[model samples]
Target chain A: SPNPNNPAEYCSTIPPLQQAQASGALSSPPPTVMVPVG
Target chain B: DLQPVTYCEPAFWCSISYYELNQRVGETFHASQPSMTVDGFTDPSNSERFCLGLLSNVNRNAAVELTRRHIGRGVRLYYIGGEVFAECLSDSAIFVQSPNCNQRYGWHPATVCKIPPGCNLKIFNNQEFAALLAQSVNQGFEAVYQLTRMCTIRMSFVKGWGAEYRRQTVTSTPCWIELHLNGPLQWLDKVLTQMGS
Candidate 1:
């Protein structure tokens, strides 16, 4: 189910990343930010 | 209808690994011969360093007037490392769908494409960023045009990374132009739409 506040919008009919994730083809976790060193 | 454009690198070049590109391919010169040997040695060269400097200088000069114009209006442009942010270049005139357009707030047609993952916002927002992007695209376009001016291989905007050199080259490629149009979450659909029109 998608969030009501921000409805799920599909940029492409086939969400490549989501598909890849579901199929276990994309093994990496969702991206998280790390602090940059100036 | 706005056609989605796709850019593809040559298969031969695309197959080459980044490591191979950075590898040195020549032998060290011997004192007696005074000439370099023909070994498969690759030089450890960082093309990004050179490209970044050239792009930054060019962009800074290009955006000077625009920066001044905005500054005069008391729009104290944010500065980092003594350079203003180029957010205006991306934000200025592109048509973004009003947030109100989405009755369900679902499937809001983005004005611009999304930024490529892993883009550095710092470089994208830098004062000279837009200029750098413009120059890079021009150079890339010329490079492609000089090689094959045929209209068959149309250039289109691809996803862009925000690192200094990365974004410049990505936006300036022969295909479609990519701009860091949206600030935080907005799509670049607006910028692309404007360019298309």
Candidate 2:
């Protein structure tokens, strides 16, 4: 639950979100979020 | 660790359980007068513009908007009660697969955003929301189309004798549409072990 809301935490679980982080675009506030709809 | 169970996941991800979607709708619309009717779905009326169509429902504001719409909004979800919900893109996107309707969620996102973005998509639960899913993916200013049947709900109060009221249920797979998505794809099983949504 804690990490569910955490963009970095949740986004980290996905493969593509890393692209945002790797780009430094997801750093401060980590604009990216994961839908994890699977 | 923070607000648990039925609480906010975070500002980034707004979460809601299916249990919440069908929570008796909070309160029921009771017709005190012996007989009355309540709409199957309690929705409001507000139309700023388009909601239905084949190729021309929504326009993109940018490239990421277009990409997200085709990918995200493409996915569809149906509630138990037959209600429809979709994951829109630019309108309300998230990640992985951001829908095209609005910036509501993200699913199979492809970090490919265009400047004057083109390519987009739209999803609708036609005539009914059961096993079939309908959607349209387009690019730039081109178009195509399809439609569906949504669940129709209407509660009618009929005077029973002289002391009570009876509610009537009627339907014939009254089709419809809304917005939402996700669960598990067997085809993708090979990729993410059939990732469950």
Candidate 3:
């Protein structure tokens, strides 16, 4: 059974995202931030 | 020094890219192992990391706006038995773009499946794609179009799409990830080229 408050729903079409190879635009990756995990 | 599991010395099984709101591309990670975790912790073992709290400088705007609760253990992805599967290990649910219409909810044409915590879902099946390839090739460029559709599985962490959710599309979500089926797609492309000759 699915959550009543959070059920799956129809999604609208999204435009294709630009890949790194296509634009050749790359940003420095953010430093890793460690958070407590359960 | 011991090599990280993610080291692509042999060959990466696939590639994963992170994306933020407004189609802001983040980082791309290569997974050399068949199974990998995508969690909040900074373990070298994690294939990809998605921590909003670390956002700073130009990225700090998102750090203030988003909640890190959706990111916990995040998710675990596995490439095995010629198929791809994602297991939601987060307390919050993650939404994945349903690959085809047949597996969609209630016959909805296009939808993303909301995978709750502990849920294991098959994101991609190799054989089904091959079947799709065989059917679309004869239609000239249809196979190429199909390749784009089948190659990647886009997913949003915590947020979901629909009228109820605040974020209506995955693109608008603050945190999301895209898994690319590099090896499988490459094989399909090779076969397609052979057919064209």
Candidate 4:
């Protein structure tokens, strides 16, 4: 039986959060990045 | 001609904090170089080494449970642009908890990924975080900040938690590291401040 906790099962796959971006958030222009607190 | 990379004036993107079981241990190590190692000892030769062994006042049981063999050379974390990757260098396994690999919504309990030796995984990604932030836009700044605070990557050395392990969570493990990626959130906070939000 495959070990369900195997990291391999999760590797190279789109994260669930990333998948959510496909329909709703991706429609907008890319968000801008800024300087971090030094 | 190669030059040494230093963090004397680094724009730290992540803060690596150590923990002994559930309790916090040692000072938070702020990182900015391209990559760094979280290991058992201080190897001055490796400029990127963040030695967890320096954390002294840990529990006696933890000291007994965690050995150099358990930790080995430890894991190396790579900061590729905004993303973070963990490459396991130990002979034993390491358990990772991150939004990039697990999900938690409603009845869905987040799963921990057990990374075997020699494997590397992208524990965090800026694009994914951006997506998460975009999803939270309708919820206001407070919600966004709360969501951002929840976005972190945690790793336990040599052991795991869940249905298969005696310890129920990463906190129960003898040793672990938590990565707080504060760059994106700090940027958003700056943006909000600039606009008086």
The C-alpha stretches of model 2 lying farther than 4 A from their native spots are A6-38, B1-54, B57-65, B81-197
Query: What fraction of native interface contacts does model 4 preserve?
Result: 0.08
Q: Rank all candidate structures by their lDDT, best first, as comma-separated numbers.
A: 4, 3, 1, 2
* Model 2, span B78-167: residue lDDT tens: 121111222222222222212221122232221211111111122212112122221111111111111111111111111101111121
Model 4 accuracy (lDDT, Cα):
0.62
**How would you encode candidate 2's per-residue C-alpha lDDT over A1-38 as one tens digit per residue?**
21222333222222222233453432332111121223
Clashing pairs in 4: none
- Superposition error at B112 for model 2 (Å): 21
Q: What is the interface RMSD of each candidate, in Å?
A: 18.5, 18.9, 17.8, 13.7
Candidate 1 reaches a DockQ of 0.04
State the TM-score of the second chain for every model: 0.16, 0.15, 0.78, 0.80
- Per-residue CA lDDT of candidate 1, range B98-166, in tens? 111221224332222231222111111211322232332334333322212111111121222222334
Off by over 4 Å in 3: A1-38, B1-10, B23-25, B43-57, B62-65, B101-109, B162-165
* Tens-place lDDT digits, model 1, residues A1-38: 22222212312223333333454423432221111111
Q: Comparing to the true complex, what docking class would candidate 2 get?
A: incorrect
Candidate number with greatest TM-score: 4
> Which of 1 and 3 is the better model by lDDT?
3
DockQ of all candidates, in order? 0.04, 0.04, 0.03, 0.10
